[PDB]
């Protein structure tokens, strides 16, 4: 899971070094800097004012930045998808069924432990009773 | 899971085309192009300026426009909370319940074949006894 | 599941008549109708310009307006939490935990009937024996 | 789970009265009060207009408030997300594995009762047969 958090971490950072070569130029309060890009790409990302704030007058400078913004999201928000979900399965899998797994891994070769015990018992009775049409 | 991708992929662009028949006219900038609905469609899909932003002024010029923007949001969110989900089940039931449904699938059947060959011993000792009330 | 997306669109109705009967006054252009009150509210649930664009132009007018927004956005997305849930639940115990569920109802009573079948040929052993220490 | 809605209404306050401290000085109208940064703790954390709308303006007065509002976020959505994720583990292993960690928990120990008796049953025939070599 926090595997991920890496490769997030990363298209954030991309991304951000990204903007700031394009669009440092002409939108300088939003992708002036490095960290300038750090903030504007964490509020794309929340899809807060993204497009009719940012995106569209960017996209009205350079029509290549159309992309960025939407390939960005589809991106940023899916790693995010295979995050939320990897907290879910790593969470519904360890609190439930890592425990149940256990138990029920104990309680079928606690049986085996049974079945191979009472075998015997009839092997030692199979001994006793083929030595007896072997005794008559 | 990916057999709706197709599906959703299709409602964006049917909805795409509906929008730049009907808006083209007097919304040029968003519903201009095809390929200018399939961006203001993916940010209403984003619910970012949705409404405020795109059906609001659309709803001022045609009044039957409030019910593409609502219908699109109802259809494509919702396929996408069928698709949400179509990566929870097959991730929750692929990393565990595949592996667990098939560990069991042979821990069963690892003791039919214990009981099904402790049978066979007592009735191998049912022949040797039975054998005995008529040799004696 | 559908029986929670009732109580929604009753709540989404009742809420709708709320702001309708307060707002109607001076905020037509939102909560004029019935069926604009129904777009607003689908807007504010969809917290699109919900506070900014809506809540805090309403509150402005009307102070105890704050609570209508706040508790509209708390119960109407939570019980689409419920409703979001209602559908993990019900499609992760279907697909895979109903399938489960039934072919091991079945694993388990296919060997009720062979540890019960066993147990008998013992006892037609257990009289075949004490049958023999009364005639020996 | 409802642990953390605690700890979450305890961030929320924390952070309420923070921003009243720092913005209230010059941003009035949203963190004049502790109940005005309760309403726009509760509007960024819903992020409409978050950071166009307040983070931005609020910002640019002191560049030390662009942590508060993403840090607030982090937190705020994130102890959601263990929030979230608290109910479709506590209602999938609810409504589904707590009733079937009985019925199973039931069925495993409902043939301890069946191998545990047909045990005795043996070890009966056992006696029987192992008192008729030292009869014969």
Redesign the interface.
């Given at each position: 899971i926090a595997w991920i958090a890496l490769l997030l971490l990363v298209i954030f950072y991309v991304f951000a070094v990204m903007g700031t070569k394009l669009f440092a130029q002409s939108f300088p309060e939003w992708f002036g800097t490095l960290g300038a890009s750090m903030?504007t790409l964490?509020?794309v990302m929340?899809?807060?004012?993204?497009?009719?704030?940012i995106?569209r007058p960017v996209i009205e400078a350079y029509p290549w930045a159309?992309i960025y913004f939407?390939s960005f999201?589809l991106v940023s928000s899916f790693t995010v998808?295979n995050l939320?979900?990897g907290?879910?399965?790593e969470?519904?899998?360890s609190?439930?069924?890592e425990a149940?797994?256990a138990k029920?891994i104990e309680?079928?070769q606690r049986?085996?432990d049974?079945?191979?015990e009472?075998?015997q018992?009839?092997?030692?009775?199979?001994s006793?009773?083929?030595?007896?049409?072997r005794?008559?």
């Open positions: 903030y964490f509020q929340t899809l807060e004012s993204w497009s009719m704030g995106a159309w939407v999201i998808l939320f979900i907290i879910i399965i969470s519904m899998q609190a439930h069924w149940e797994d029920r309680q079928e049986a085996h049974e079945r191979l009472m075998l018992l009839i092997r030692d009775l199979s006793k009773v083929d030595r007896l049409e005794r008559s």
